């Protein structure tokens, strides 16, 4: 996914 870095940043918010 070309937007995987943005998805990673959102994943980091899932605490």
């Amino acid at each position, epitope marked *: *996914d*070309p*937007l*995987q870095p*943005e*998805l990673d*940043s*959102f*994943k980091e918010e*899932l605490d």
Partner: nanobody
Amino acid sequence: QVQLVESGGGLVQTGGSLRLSCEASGSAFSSYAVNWYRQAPGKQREPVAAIGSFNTVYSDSVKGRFTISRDNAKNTVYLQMNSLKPEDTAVYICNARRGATNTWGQGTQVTVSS
């Protein structure tokens, strides 16, 4: 450089479904990931779901019940919400993310009652 507007909220029976839309106006929408958050009065805002061009991420709170999807031809991202519970009641708001820059919508109300 996009503006976002949410729609599709309402008042629905417990166990029912809604489909929210996050519509974007502006250029290069395909270069933004789209994230849904929700926030009830008195509480903190929490992440719900995210989509890139096609890959998706879900909070554990909605896994198996919600599905996020994207149609760039319509500059729209959808959040299909199934098996809704009273605890899903909140304002749902979308967020377009391009690198470290974030744009936010306004919010649409979702109320779930039995």
